Symmetry: C3
């Protein structure tokens, strides 16, 4: 009887593994990107930093925070796809000139475009990623593509 | 020993599925879904007249948003606020004027009518819309409102 | 009997996961997807020329919509009707004019050509589009059509 039940359970699990794998592909198309254990997903629209940040946190995640070249490339795919620069999670709002993650830790990876960050006009504390994958500090009030990570 | 080994194996596979699925649930609901209790509201993102909206939800295996508690109503309101578009609820008093029911015919177990509503304005309001402030108003079924289904 | 209870526990978890997964699958398909058999069609919601559309589907781990039966075609038609935009199918006759094949080079096992099609108009129609009425027409691969992938 146990052997009978174990077999039924094995089949149920195998079915779920197959169904789940197909479902993951469906979910990620066309607004998501999986890289490592991280998943980037764009909302498809633009918002200023504070609004974008709240949407991500309320959804149980946070604004895109690429921590490696591999993550940045995955994120860049969505930006290129929507042809819209996106906001990253990092800012130097606390200490001008020092960009940090929402936790408060210092950047462990960066991909600044030449000359950036430059605090243009003395008011750029947020970061945007261009279609070429490079970063630029930009005013938090501007509207950029919303991309969260989970 | 084999059965034991088999069981332990299944344990690890199930743990992987649960963790992987837990992540995908969050990804899926962003930005058009809202989970509340065991119910999930999902907006189509566009507006349609009542009959069209209702068919979309039913064919999808669900039904139009039917908040049955203040918590469910507040969750649905979040989507309405996000899209900034009032949405249709599933309930109507099409059978018996003044008596609103769910698609199953059951009487309402919760309501959040704006003051003075429902008022059957113009003698022709049998459907219900929820505003960005979460309050309800009976409205003509021919009007176009945000489509939100529950699953 | 410790394995009996362990198996009992694991199954409850598995069945709860099955229920949650089923609910999330319905949510996922609303309103841009359609399930038919073991196949799932999902539209990106925008249009693109054939080559770009084909790349999007393959990079996503799938391929362009390839209806292989009347049932599959009807499901795909639902999405085309909903978006009110004709979509590209995966099949082409680029290798041998007049002979349409799936990306694998295999010959069609089902077709739903509109009357008079395929006609290779202008001597340059090697791709296929499906209309809101479900019928097919060969069309120039450079045209932009709704992107629908199958998984
Ligand atoms: O454009 C290629 C397409 O042309 C014809 O279809 C026309 C149709 O005749 C017009 O009435 C209108 O619907 O525009 C269509 C697209 O131009 C051919 O019938 C068709 O075979 C061909 O692919
Ligand atoms: O307008 C704001 C932007 O202008 C230019 O692109 C500058 O190179 C950049 O640093 C700045 O953020
Ligand atoms: O125009 C229709 C609506 O007009 C106003 O909002 C009334 O307060 C409301 O009761 C009615 O349904
Ligand atoms: Ca500053
Ligand atoms: Ca700054
Ligand atoms: Ca700058
Ligand atoms: Ca009436
Ligand atoms: Ca009425
Ligand atoms: Ca009213
Ligand atoms: Ca040809
Ligand atoms: Ca041809
Ligand atoms: Ca033709």
């Amino acid at each position: 009887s146990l052997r009978q039940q174990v077999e039924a359970l094995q089949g149920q699990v195998q079915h779920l593994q197959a169904a789940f794998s197909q479902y993951k592909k469906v979910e990620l198309f066309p607004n998501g990107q999986s890289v490592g254990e991280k998943i980037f997903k764009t909302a498809g629209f633009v918002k200023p930093f504070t609004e974008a940040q709240l949407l991500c946190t309320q959804a149980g995640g946070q604004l895109a925070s690429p921590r490696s070249a591999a993550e940045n490339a995955a994120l860049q795919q969505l930006v290129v796809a929507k042809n819209e620069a996106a906001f990253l999670s990092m800012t130097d709002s606390k200490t001008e000139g020092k960009f940090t993650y929402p936790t408060g830790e210092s950047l462990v990876y960066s991909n600044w475009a030449p000359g950036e960050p430059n605090d243009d006009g003395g008011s750029e504390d947020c970061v945007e990623i261009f279609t070429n994958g490079k970063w630029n500090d930009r005013a938090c009030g501007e509207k950029r593509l919303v991309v969260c990570e989970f």
